[PDB]
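About this split. The held-out portion is used to measure sequence recovery: a designer receives only the structure tokens and must propose an amino acid at every position. Recovery is the fraction of positions where the proposal matches the reference. Here is one held-out target exactly as it appears in the evaluation file.
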């Protein structure tokens, strides 16, 4: 079990389909709720991580997810 920028592995997996390059889907409730305790500036630090490629994450969709979730703050990356 890990904490990456406020999100557990379970929560990152919950959000994964809403940031996938291929066939993304609308964010789930559990994803949006978890993002309410995530550290966006911390998450932005992963913008160039090889992990985005490995997990098929789209950095643009990832950037867009807080707004999709109706959060008031949004990731400066
Ligand atoms: C900067 C603005 C904010 C950006 C917001 C980003 C939101 C979240 C980004 C999500 C990235 C998702 C990467 C997924 C990594 C999951 C870890 C993993 O490898 O999975 C763990 C497996 O063990 C689970 O597999 P399983 O489902 O349990 O088994 C079937
Ligand atoms: C254009 C706009 C740009 C904005 C960019 C926004 C970027 C958003 C970044 C969020 C990315 C976070 C991805 C982190 C994936 C964690 C991988 C991981 O946790 O590794 C776990 C497994 O590998 C190990 O597996 P295990 O056995 O379960 O270990 C327990
Ligand atoms: Zn652990
Ligand atoms: Zn959490
Ligand atoms: Zn949570």
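Reference sequence for scoring:
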């Amino acid at each position: 079990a890990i904490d990456l920028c406020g999100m557990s592995q379970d929560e990152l997996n919950e959000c994964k389909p809403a940031v996938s390059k291929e066939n993304p889907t609308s964010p789930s409730q559990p994803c949006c709720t978890a993002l309410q305790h995530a550290d966006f500036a911390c998450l932005c630090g992963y913008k160039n991580s090889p992990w985005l490629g490995s997990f098929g994450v789209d950095p643009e969709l990832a950037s867009a997810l807080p707004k999709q979730c109706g959060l008031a703050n949004a990731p400066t990356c």
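Annotator remark: The chain has one domain: 1-77.
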